[PDB]
Design a binder for this molecule. Structure first.
Ligand SMILES: N#CCc1nccn1CC(F)(F)F
Lengths: 179, 245
């Protein structure tokens, strides 16, 4: 089992912390949802290869431009996250997060992940966004952003229902193993 | 960590740590506030344990077993004794506030109503000046420590054997040398998230809401000062590379 490092980046509203928590416990917390994530080393077997995948969050570092890059050394795969209930989180991907990750993590594969996919057809979400002349991110808008930023791929998931979560981390492991 | 504190913080939440008959006596808003305060203390206990792995298992083990050149152990573990003193003192204060709040006859049932004043004290005055000085130094030496570790692991056989030996146990799975360094650098930016969530559930007593609002502001001022005081040191970087920053 070779060791690989994963870092998740994105706006605070993207749900990155919840995504790492749900994957690391294989469960959405039923009693208490933690505020923070320390680190974790997941044992993953993908396509017959065993990997130890270290997981790291960047939550809390968004306002600190000299502290935040200390999370990047030796990263093997980046999850670049946005929330489907927030077009604003998707707008911040190409001009803020992408040039930063390309500078500190050259040639590292990026997977663009649309989180909170369960809110795409949620009535309360559609009513709230329509007040700002917005609507949930459509799958083609996510794929087009991934294509534009040079992402390795585009994936969607829901930390609330767990759908798609295992697939995201198995694919990140495959991306981390590539030459 | 010592067994008494590990068992006191073994549960995933305060609501699972206290007796169910005691939990039933409180309103939902109190339970929410206590669950977040319990996460702050539990994660502080784990952070002090990370610093003990760095000082006792790694640093002291290298001094007692290996023949490294002078300045190498300090280069791998910059400021670790100062960081351990800062956080062991803060953890002691948090655990004393919990111990005073215990019901007579219990070692697990408590409610902490006055955390704000403790956080203002930690994040102001001489203790805040020492946290700023220590983290500005540690975080500016972070790249250099990782690079020195990587060079020794790839070139020194006795060093590689030592690291593989002390990191073999399953309890060290998340705590290799580089992992410890980034856990410590990331600790300081977890505080605002935790304090803001405690504050969200502390409106019941206005003096407490005001004290946590003051503490949140002091923590953000400390982080802004540390962030502005960082410049990565690099072994072999010439003066010309520095003054042309
Ligand atoms: N996290 C990291 C390495 C880093 N720092 C600044 C730039 N880079 C990328 C490079 F090392 F140049 F490839």
């Amino acid at each position: 089992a070779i060791r690989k490092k994963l870092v998740i980046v994105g706006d605070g509203a993207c749900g990155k912390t919840c995504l790492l928590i749900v994957f690391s416990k294989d469960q959405f917390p039923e009693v208490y949802v933690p505020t923070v994530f320390e680190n974790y080393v997941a044992d993953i077997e993908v396509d017959g290869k065993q990997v130890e995948l270290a997981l790291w969050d960047t939550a809390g570092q968004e306002d600190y431009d000299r502290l935040r890059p200390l999370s990047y050394p030796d990263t093997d795969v980046i999850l670049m996250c946005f929330s489907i209930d927030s077009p604003d989180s998707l707008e911040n991907i190409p001009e803020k997060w992408t040039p930063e990750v390309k500078h500190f993590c050259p040639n590292v594969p990026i997977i663009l992940v649309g989180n909170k996919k369960d809110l795409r057809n949620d009535e309360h979400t559609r009513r709230e966004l329509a007040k700002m002349k917005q609507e949930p991110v459509k799958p083609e808008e996510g794929r087009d952003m991934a294509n534009r930023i040079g992402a390795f791929g585009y994936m969607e998931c829901s930390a609330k229902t767990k759908d798609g979560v295992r697939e995201v981390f198995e694919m990140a492991t495959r991306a981390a193993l590539q030459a | 960590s010592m067994e008494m504190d590990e068992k006191d913080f073994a549960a995933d939440s305060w609501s699972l740590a206290v007796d169910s008959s005691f939990l039933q006596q409180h309103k939902k808003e109190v339970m929410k506030q206590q669950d977040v305060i319990y996460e702050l203390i539990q994660t502080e206990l784990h952070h002090v344990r990370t610093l003990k792995i760095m000082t006792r298992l790694f640093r002291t083990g290298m001094l007692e077993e290996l023949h490294l050149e002078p300045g190498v152990v300090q280069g791998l573990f910059p400021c670790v004794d100062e960081l351990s003193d800062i956080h062991t003192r803060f953890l002691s204060q948090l655990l004393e506030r919990r111990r005073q709040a215990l019901c007579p006859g219990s070692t697990r049932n408590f409610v902490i109503h006055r955390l704000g004043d403790l956080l203002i004290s930690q994040f102001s005055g001489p203790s805040a000046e020492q946290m700023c000085k220590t983290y500005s130094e540690f975080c500016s030496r972070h790249s250099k420590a990782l690079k020195l570790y990587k060079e020794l692991y790839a070139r020194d056989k006795r060093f590689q054997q030592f690291i593989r030996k002390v990191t073999r146990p399953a309890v060290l799975k998340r705590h290799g040398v580089q992992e410890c360094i980034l856990l410590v650098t990331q600790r300081i930016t977890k505080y605002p998230l935790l304090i803001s969530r405690i504050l969200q559930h502390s409106h019941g007593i206005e003096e407490e809401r005001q004290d946590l609002t003051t503490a949140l502001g002091l923590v953000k001022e400390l982080l802004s000062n540390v962030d502005e005081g960082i410049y990565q040191l690099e072994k072999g970087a010439r003066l010309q590379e520095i003054y042309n920053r």
